Protein backbone atom coordinates (compact mmCIF):
# COMPACT_ATOMS: atom_id res chain seq x y z
CA UNK A 1 0.00 0.00 0.00
CA UNK A 2 1.33 3.40 -1.10
CA UNK A 3 -1.13 6.28 -1.28
CA UNK A 4 -0.87 8.59 -4.23
CA UNK A 5 -0.66 12.41 -4.32
CA UNK A 6 -4.06 13.81 -3.60
CA UNK A 7 -2.13 15.94 -1.10
CA UNK A 8 -0.34 17.87 -3.84
CA UNK A 9 -3.52 19.13 -5.52
CA UNK A 10 -5.74 19.59 -2.46
CA UNK A 11 -3.06 21.15 -0.24
CA UNK A 12 -1.57 23.96 -2.30
CA UNK A 13 -0.88 27.55 -1.33
CA UNK A 14 -1.78 28.86 -4.81
CA UNK A 15 -4.31 27.55 -7.28
CA UNK A 16 -4.07 28.89 -10.80
CA UNK A 17 -6.86 31.06 -12.16
CA UNK A 18 -9.59 29.60 -14.33
CA UNK A 19 -8.38 30.90 -17.71
CA UNK A 20 -5.35 28.60 -17.31
CA UNK A 21 -6.07 25.68 -15.02
CA UNK A 22 -3.41 23.11 -14.16
CA UNK A 23 -4.05 19.49 -15.15
CA UNK A 24 -2.26 16.87 -13.04
CA UNK A 25 -2.34 13.37 -14.52
CA UNK A 26 -2.44 10.97 -11.55
CA UNK A 27 -1.60 7.35 -12.34
CA UNK A 28 -0.14 4.23 -10.67
CA UNK A 29 -1.96 4.63 -7.37
CA UNK A 30 -3.80 2.76 -4.79
CA UNK A 31 -5.93 5.82 -4.14
CA UNK A 32 -8.45 6.48 -1.37
CA UNK A 33 -11.38 8.71 -2.28
CA UNK A 34 -13.17 8.08 1.03
CA UNK A 35 -10.65 10.33 2.79
CA UNK A 36 -11.98 13.07 0.51
CA UNK A 37 -15.58 11.95 1.10
CA UNK A 38 -15.30 12.06 4.92
CA UNK A 39 -13.45 15.37 5.34
CA UNK A 40 -16.53 17.53 6.19
CA UNK A 41 -14.91 20.69 4.75
CA UNK A 42 -16.21 20.46 1.17
CA UNK A 43 -19.33 22.49 0.40
CA UNK A 44 -19.99 20.76 -2.94
CA UNK A 45 -19.15 17.07 -3.44
CA UNK A 46 -21.29 16.11 -6.44
CA UNK A 47 -20.37 13.02 -8.46
CA UNK A 48 -21.73 12.66 -11.97
CA UNK A 49 -21.65 9.00 -12.96
CA UNK A 50 -20.10 7.13 -10.05
CA UNK A 51 -21.73 6.30 -6.74
CA UNK A 52 -19.63 8.39 -4.32
CA UNK A 53 -19.96 6.10 -1.29
CA UNK A 54 -18.59 3.18 -3.36
CA UNK A 55 -15.63 4.93 -5.01
CA UNK A 56 -13.05 2.43 -3.74
CA UNK A 57 -14.63 -0.50 -5.60
CA UNK A 58 -13.70 0.71 -9.09
CA UNK A 59 -10.54 0.68 -11.21
CA UNK A 60 -9.80 3.47 -13.70
CA UNK A 61 -6.91 4.11 -16.09
CA UNK A 62 -6.03 7.79 -15.58
CA UNK A 63 -7.49 10.05 -12.90
CA UNK A 64 -7.08 13.64 -14.08
CA UNK A 65 -7.46 16.52 -11.61
CA UNK A 66 -8.14 20.07 -12.78
CA UNK A 67 -8.08 22.93 -10.27
CA UNK A 68 -9.03 26.61 -10.45
CA UNK A 69 -10.50 29.49 -8.43
CA UNK A 70 -13.90 30.99 -9.27
CA UNK A 71 -16.67 32.85 -7.47
CA UNK A 72 -19.09 30.90 -5.32
CA UNK A 73 -22.09 31.81 -7.45
CA UNK A 74 -20.35 30.30 -10.51
CA UNK A 75 -19.70 26.76 -9.26
CA UNK A 76 -23.10 25.89 -10.73
CA UNK A 77 -21.37 26.08 -14.13
CA UNK A 78 -18.92 23.26 -13.33
CA UNK A 79 -21.69 20.74 -13.93
CA UNK A 80 -22.27 18.79 -17.18
CA UNK A 81 -24.81 20.64 -19.32
CA UNK A 82 -24.90 24.00 -17.54
CA UNK A 83 -23.52 27.01 -19.43
CA UNK A 84 -22.62 30.61 -18.69
CA UNK A 85 -19.63 32.94 -18.76
CA UNK A 86 -17.38 30.35 -17.07
CA UNK A 87 -18.58 27.09 -18.60
CA UNK A 88 -18.13 28.22 -22.21
CA UNK A 89 -15.07 30.50 -22.29
CA UNK A 90 -13.00 29.24 -19.33
CA UNK A 91 -13.63 25.56 -18.48
CA UNK A 92 -16.11 23.34 -20.33
CA UNK A 93 -17.07 19.88 -19.02
CA UNK A 94 -18.46 17.25 -21.42
CA UNK A 95 -22.02 15.94 -21.21
CA UNK A 96 -20.82 12.34 -20.80
CA UNK A 97 -18.57 13.36 -17.91
CA UNK A 98 -17.89 10.71 -15.23
CA UNK A 99 -16.25 12.45 -12.29
CA UNK A 100 -16.73 14.33 -9.03
CA UNK A 101 -16.62 18.12 -8.71
CA UNK A 102 -15.18 19.22 -5.35
CA UNK A 103 -15.18 22.78 -4.00
CA UNK A 104 -14.90 24.66 -0.72
CA UNK A 105 -14.88 28.23 0.55
CA UNK A 106 -11.46 29.85 0.46
CA UNK A 107 -11.89 33.35 1.84
CA UNK A 108 -8.89 32.98 4.16
CA UNK A 109 -6.30 33.03 1.38
CA UNK A 110 -7.57 34.43 -1.91
CA UNK A 111 -9.00 37.69 -0.51
CA UNK A 112 -7.11 40.86 0.42
CA UNK A 113 -8.87 43.91 1.86
CA UNK A 114 -7.49 46.29 -0.77
CA UNK A 115 -8.28 43.78 -3.48
CA UNK A 116 -6.68 40.61 -4.83
CA UNK A 117 -6.38 41.10 -8.59
CA UNK A 118 -4.23 38.03 -9.24
CA UNK A 119 -7.07 35.75 -10.37
CA UNK A 120 -8.28 36.31 -13.92
CA UNK A 121 -11.07 34.87 -16.05
CA UNK A 122 -11.80 35.07 -19.75
CA UNK A 123 -14.43 37.62 -20.71
CA UNK A 124 -15.34 36.72 -24.29
CA UNK A 125 -14.24 34.49 -27.16
CA UNK A 126 -15.01 34.08 -30.85
CA UNK A 127 -16.65 30.69 -30.24
CA UNK A 128 -17.30 28.43 -27.28
CA UNK A 129 -14.95 25.80 -25.86
CA UNK A 130 -14.83 22.13 -26.71
CA UNK A 131 -14.56 19.93 -23.58
CA UNK A 132 -11.18 20.07 -21.79
CA UNK A 133 -9.59 22.86 -23.82
CA UNK A 134 -7.74 25.88 -22.44
CA UNK A 135 -7.01 29.14 -24.27
CA UNK A 136 -3.96 31.12 -23.15
CA UNK A 137 -4.26 33.74 -25.90
CA UNK A 138 -3.82 37.00 -23.98
CA UNK A 139 -3.91 39.58 -26.75
CA UNK A 140 -6.17 42.37 -28.00
CA UNK A 141 -9.54 41.38 -29.48
CA UNK A 142 -9.20 44.18 -32.10
CA UNK A 143 -12.69 45.00 -33.27
CA UNK A 144 -13.26 47.82 -35.73
CA UNK A 145 -10.98 48.78 -38.59
CA UNK A 146 -7.66 49.79 -37.03
CA UNK A 147 -4.92 47.67 -35.41
CA UNK A 148 -4.66 48.51 -31.72
CA UNK A 149 -0.88 47.71 -31.68
CA UNK A 150 -1.02 46.31 -28.16
CA UNK A 151 -2.88 49.06 -26.27
CA UNK A 152 -6.38 49.23 -24.78
CA UNK A 153 -8.83 51.80 -26.06
CA UNK A 154 -11.82 52.49 -28.29
CA UNK A 155 -11.74 49.21 -30.25
CA UNK A 156 -9.29 47.02 -28.33
CA UNK A 157 -11.09 45.23 -25.43
CA UNK A 158 -8.47 43.17 -23.58
CA UNK A 159 -10.26 39.86 -22.86
CA UNK A 160 -8.96 39.06 -19.33
CA UNK A 161 -10.73 40.77 -16.43
CA UNK A 162 -9.54 40.40 -12.85
CA UNK A 163 -11.60 39.00 -10.01
CA UNK A 164 -11.93 41.79 -7.49
CA UNK A 165 -11.74 39.76 -4.29
CA UNK A 166 -12.26 41.16 -0.79
CA UNK A 167 -13.33 39.72 2.57
CA UNK A 168 -16.54 41.81 2.27
CA UNK A 169 -18.32 40.74 -0.92
CA UNK A 170 -21.03 38.31 0.03
CA UNK A 171 -20.78 34.55 0.40
CA UNK A 172 -21.42 33.99 -3.30
CA UNK A 173 -18.69 36.38 -4.42
CA UNK A 174 -16.08 34.90 -2.09
CA UNK A 175 -13.46 32.71 -3.83
CA UNK A 176 -14.28 29.00 -3.94
CA UNK A 177 -11.33 26.73 -4.71
CA UNK A 178 -12.71 24.15 -7.15
CA UNK A 179 -10.96 20.87 -7.92
CA UNK A 180 -12.67 18.50 -10.36
CA UNK A 181 -11.56 14.90 -10.69
CA UNK A 182 -12.05 13.32 -14.11
CA UNK A 183 -11.98 9.53 -14.12
CA UNK A 184 -11.15 7.82 -17.41
CA UNK A 185 -11.43 4.18 -18.49
CA UNK A 186 -9.74 3.81 -21.86
CA UNK A 187 -8.83 0.43 -23.33
CA UNK A 188 -5.75 -0.38 -21.26
CA UNK A 189 -4.70 -2.08 -18.02
CA UNK A 190 -6.09 -0.37 -14.92
CA UNK A 191 -3.74 1.04 -12.27
CA UNK A 192 -5.65 3.45 -9.99
CA UNK A 193 -7.76 0.94 -8.04
CA UNK A 194 -7.74 1.46 -4.27
Amino acid at each position, epitope marked *: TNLCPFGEVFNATRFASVYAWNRKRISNCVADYSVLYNSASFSTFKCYGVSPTKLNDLCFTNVYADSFVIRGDEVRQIAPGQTGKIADYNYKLPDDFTGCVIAWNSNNLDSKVGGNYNYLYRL*FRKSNLKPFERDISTEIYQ*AG*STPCNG*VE*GFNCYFPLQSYGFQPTNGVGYQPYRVVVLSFELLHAPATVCG
Partner: antibody
Amino acid sequence: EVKLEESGGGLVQPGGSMKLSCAASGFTFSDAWMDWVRQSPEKGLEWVAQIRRKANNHATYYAESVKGRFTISRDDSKSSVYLQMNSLRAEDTGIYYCIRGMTYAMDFWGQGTSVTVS
Amino acid sequence: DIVMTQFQKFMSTSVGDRVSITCKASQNVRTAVAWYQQKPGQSPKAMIYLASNRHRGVPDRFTGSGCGTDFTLTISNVQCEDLADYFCLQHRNYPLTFGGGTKLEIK
Protein backbone atom coordinates in the same frame (compact mmCIF):
# COMPACT_ATOMS: atom_id res chain seq x y z
CA GLU B 1 -22.64 56.40 -8.76
CA VAL B 2 -21.87 57.99 -12.14
CA LYS B 3 -23.36 61.29 -13.29
CA LEU B 4 -22.37 63.68 -16.07
CA GLU B 5 -23.32 67.36 -16.24
CA GLU B 6 -23.17 69.80 -19.15
CA SER B 7 -23.05 73.56 -19.64
CA GLY B 8 -23.08 76.20 -22.37
CA GLY B 9 -26.81 76.64 -22.86
CA GLY B 10 -27.59 79.60 -25.09
CA LEU B 11 -28.27 80.92 -28.57
CA VAL B 12 -25.77 82.68 -30.84
CA GLN B 13 -26.12 84.90 -33.85
CA PRO B 14 -25.00 83.05 -37.03
CA GLY B 15 -21.21 83.28 -37.17
CA GLY B 16 -20.30 83.27 -33.47
CA SER B 17 -18.78 80.73 -31.12
CA MET B 18 -19.39 79.00 -27.79
CA LYS B 19 -17.57 76.56 -25.52
CA LEU B 20 -19.32 73.56 -24.00
CA SER B 21 -18.16 71.87 -20.80
CA CYS B 22 -18.86 68.38 -19.46
CA ALA B 23 -18.08 67.89 -15.77
CA ALA B 24 -17.95 64.23 -14.73
CA SER B 25 -17.88 62.53 -11.34
CA GLY B 26 -18.05 59.07 -9.82
CA PHE B 27 -15.44 57.17 -11.85
CA THR B 28 -11.79 57.12 -12.90
CA PHE B 29 -11.65 59.87 -15.52
CA SER B 30 -8.25 59.15 -17.06
CA ASP B 31 -9.43 56.01 -18.94
CA ALA B 32 -12.67 56.71 -20.82
CA TRP B 33 -13.09 57.27 -24.56
CA MET B 34 -15.46 60.21 -24.10
CA ASP B 35 -17.44 61.43 -27.12
CA TRP B 36 -19.93 64.14 -28.06
CA VAL B 37 -23.18 63.31 -29.86
CA ARG B 38 -25.67 65.78 -31.31
CA GLN B 39 -29.34 65.18 -32.15
CA SER B 40 -31.55 67.27 -34.41
CA PRO B 41 -35.26 66.69 -35.15
CA GLU B 42 -34.75 67.08 -38.92
CA LYS B 43 -31.72 64.82 -39.50
CA GLY B 44 -31.73 62.55 -36.44
CA LEU B 45 -28.79 61.37 -34.39
CA GLU B 46 -25.31 62.36 -35.60
CA TRP B 47 -21.75 62.23 -34.26
CA VAL B 48 -19.55 65.26 -33.49
CA ALA B 49 -16.19 64.42 -31.94
CA GLN B 50 -14.12 62.05 -29.83
CA ILE B 51 -11.16 62.26 -27.46
CA ARG B 52 -9.46 59.08 -26.28
CA ARG B 53 -7.74 58.22 -23.00
CA LYS B 54 -4.26 59.05 -21.73
CA ALA B 55 -2.62 55.74 -22.74
CA ASN B 56 -3.29 56.57 -26.42
CA ASN B 57 -1.73 60.05 -25.94
CA HIS B 58 -5.16 61.79 -25.98
CA ALA B 59 -5.96 61.21 -29.64
CA THR B 60 -8.79 63.17 -31.23
CA TYR B 61 -11.24 62.37 -34.02
CA TYR B 62 -13.93 64.49 -35.65
CA ALA B 63 -16.77 64.12 -38.13
CA GLU B 64 -16.75 65.37 -41.71
CA SER B 65 -18.89 68.48 -41.13
CA VAL B 66 -16.94 69.82 -38.13
CA LYS B 67 -13.30 69.38 -39.21
CA GLY B 68 -11.95 72.89 -38.67
CA ARG B 69 -14.92 74.41 -36.83
CA PHE B 70 -14.93 72.28 -33.65
CA THR B 71 -12.09 71.37 -31.29
CA ILE B 72 -12.34 68.87 -28.42
CA SER B 73 -9.88 68.81 -25.51
CA ARG B 74 -9.84 67.20 -22.07
CA ASP B 75 -8.01 67.86 -18.80
CA ASP B 76 -7.90 65.08 -16.20
CA SER B 77 -7.30 67.48 -13.28
CA LYS B 78 -10.86 68.86 -13.34
CA SER B 79 -12.47 65.65 -14.72
CA SER B 80 -13.83 67.60 -17.67
CA VAL B 81 -14.30 67.34 -21.44
CA TYR B 82 -14.53 70.56 -23.45
CA LEU B 83 -16.00 70.99 -26.94
CA GLN B 84 -14.67 74.28 -28.31
CA MET B 85 -16.65 75.16 -31.44
CA ASN B 86 -15.98 78.16 -33.68
CA SER B 87 -17.79 79.80 -36.63
CA LEU B 88 -21.19 78.19 -36.18
CA ARG B 89 -23.60 77.76 -39.09
CA ALA B 90 -27.38 77.79 -39.47
CA GLU B 91 -27.75 73.99 -39.36
CA ASP B 92 -26.07 73.59 -35.95
CA THR B 93 -29.25 73.47 -33.82
CA GLY B 94 -29.58 70.45 -31.57
CA ILE B 95 -29.05 68.91 -28.16
CA TYR B 96 -25.47 67.85 -27.31
CA TYR B 97 -24.99 64.82 -25.06
CA CYS B 98 -21.86 63.75 -23.19
CA ILE B 99 -20.87 60.08 -23.19
CA ARG B 100 -18.56 58.19 -20.84
CA GLY B 101 -17.58 55.33 -23.13
CA MET B 102 -19.30 54.51 -26.40
CA THR B 103 -20.05 50.98 -27.71
CA TYR B 104 -18.75 49.02 -24.73
CA ALA B 105 -19.68 48.67 -21.08
CA MET B 106 -19.75 51.66 -18.70
CA ASP B 107 -21.85 53.48 -21.32
CA PHE B 108 -23.71 56.34 -19.62
CA TRP B 109 -24.90 59.27 -21.71
CA GLY B 110 -25.34 62.69 -20.17
CA GLN B 111 -28.37 64.96 -20.36
CA GLY B 112 -27.42 67.58 -22.94
CA THR B 113 -27.74 71.35 -23.27
CA SER B 114 -29.40 72.77 -26.38
CA VAL B 115 -27.35 75.21 -28.46
CA THR B 116 -29.06 76.91 -31.40
CA VAL B 117 -28.35 79.83 -33.71
CA SER B 118 -30.38 82.90 -34.61
CA ASP C 1 -18.99 56.98 -44.84
CA ILE C 2 -20.87 53.79 -43.95
CA VAL C 3 -24.60 54.42 -43.76
CA MET C 4 -27.01 52.27 -41.77
CA THR C 5 -30.58 52.16 -42.99
CA GLN C 6 -33.66 51.21 -41.02
CA PHE C 7 -36.68 50.13 -43.06
CA GLN C 8 -39.28 50.52 -40.30
CA LYS C 9 -40.02 54.04 -39.07
CA PHE C 10 -43.10 52.75 -37.19
CA MET C 11 -43.63 49.29 -35.69
CA SER C 12 -46.94 49.01 -33.84
CA THR C 13 -47.87 46.02 -31.69
CA SER C 14 -49.94 45.06 -28.67
CA VAL C 15 -48.77 44.03 -25.21
CA GLY C 16 -47.23 40.57 -25.26
CA ASP C 17 -46.12 40.08 -28.87
CA ARG C 18 -42.64 40.05 -30.40
CA VAL C 19 -41.25 42.87 -32.55
CA SER C 20 -38.05 42.57 -34.61
CA ILE C 21 -36.46 45.88 -35.60
CA THR C 22 -33.86 45.63 -38.37
CA CYS C 23 -30.83 47.69 -39.38
CA LYS C 24 -28.94 46.96 -42.61
CA ALA C 25 -25.36 48.06 -43.26
CA SER C 26 -23.96 49.60 -46.44
CA GLN C 27 -20.74 47.58 -46.61
CA ASN C 28 -19.44 44.80 -44.40
CA VAL C 29 -19.17 45.90 -40.79
CA ARG C 30 -17.95 42.94 -38.79
CA THR C 31 -19.76 42.83 -35.44
CA ALA C 32 -19.24 46.44 -34.39
CA VAL C 33 -22.86 47.58 -34.11
CA ALA C 34 -24.55 48.99 -31.00
CA TRP C 35 -28.19 49.69 -30.14
CA TYR C 36 -29.86 52.47 -28.14
CA GLN C 37 -33.30 53.08 -26.61
CA GLN C 38 -34.59 56.63 -26.17
CA LYS C 39 -37.75 57.22 -24.17
CA PRO C 40 -39.41 60.51 -25.26
CA GLY C 41 -38.09 63.36 -23.15
CA GLN C 42 -34.87 61.62 -22.11
CA SER C 43 -31.29 60.71 -23.12
CA PRO C 44 -30.74 57.29 -24.75
CA LYS C 45 -29.74 54.35 -22.57
CA ALA C 46 -27.54 51.72 -24.18
CA MET C 47 -28.83 48.15 -24.48
CA ILE C 48 -26.63 46.15 -26.87
CA TYR C 49 -22.87 46.52 -27.28
CA LEU C 50 -20.90 44.69 -30.00
CA ALA C 51 -24.22 43.51 -31.54
CA SER C 52 -24.75 40.44 -29.32
CA ASN C 53 -23.85 41.25 -25.69
CA ARG C 54 -26.18 43.02 -23.27
CA HIS C 55 -25.68 45.79 -20.74
CA ARG C 56 -26.09 45.79 -16.96
CA GLY C 57 -29.70 46.30 -15.93
CA VAL C 58 -31.26 45.63 -19.35
CA PRO C 59 -33.86 42.79 -19.16
CA ASP C 60 -33.74 39.33 -20.74
CA ARG C 61 -36.30 40.43 -23.35
CA PHE C 62 -34.07 42.78 -25.36
CA THR C 63 -31.95 40.27 -27.30
CA GLY C 64 -30.24 40.90 -30.61
CA SER C 65 -27.69 39.46 -32.99
CA GLY C 66 -26.44 39.78 -36.56
CA CYS C 67 -23.22 39.85 -38.54
CA GLY C 68 -22.09 41.06 -41.93
CA THR C 69 -24.83 43.26 -43.33
CA ASP C 70 -28.04 42.51 -41.39
CA PHE C 71 -28.58 43.31 -37.69
CA THR C 72 -31.86 42.65 -35.87
CA LEU C 73 -32.96 43.58 -32.35
CA THR C 74 -35.89 41.40 -31.28
CA ILE C 75 -37.89 42.29 -28.17
CA SER C 76 -40.24 39.83 -26.47
CA ASN C 77 -43.26 40.29 -24.17
CA VAL C 78 -43.59 43.97 -25.02
CA GLN C 79 -44.58 45.94 -21.94
CA CYS C 80 -46.09 49.41 -22.02
CA GLU C 81 -42.72 50.88 -20.96
CA ASP C 82 -41.19 50.04 -24.37
CA LEU C 83 -42.57 52.94 -26.37
CA ALA C 84 -39.30 54.52 -27.49
CA ASP C 85 -37.00 55.39 -30.38
CA TYR C 86 -34.56 52.61 -31.29
CA PHE C 87 -31.32 53.56 -33.05
CA CYS C 88 -28.38 51.59 -34.42
CA LEU C 89 -24.79 52.81 -34.63
CA GLN C 90 -21.87 51.20 -36.43
CA HIS C 91 -18.36 51.91 -35.20
CA ARG C 92 -16.21 50.14 -37.78
CA ASN C 93 -14.30 53.19 -38.97
CA TYR C 94 -14.28 56.65 -37.54
CA PRO C 95 -17.20 58.25 -39.39
CA LEU C 96 -19.71 56.81 -36.92
CA THR C 97 -23.22 56.90 -38.38
CA PHE C 98 -26.38 56.40 -36.35
CA GLY C 99 -29.45 54.75 -37.81
CA GLY C 100 -32.72 56.42 -38.64
CA GLY C 101 -34.78 55.30 -35.66
CA THR C 102 -37.93 53.26 -34.97
CA LYS C 103 -40.80 54.62 -32.88
CA LEU C 104 -43.11 51.99 -31.37
CA GLU C 105 -46.74 52.28 -30.32
CA ILE C 106 -48.95 49.97 -28.29
CA LYS C 107 -52.44 49.84 -29.82
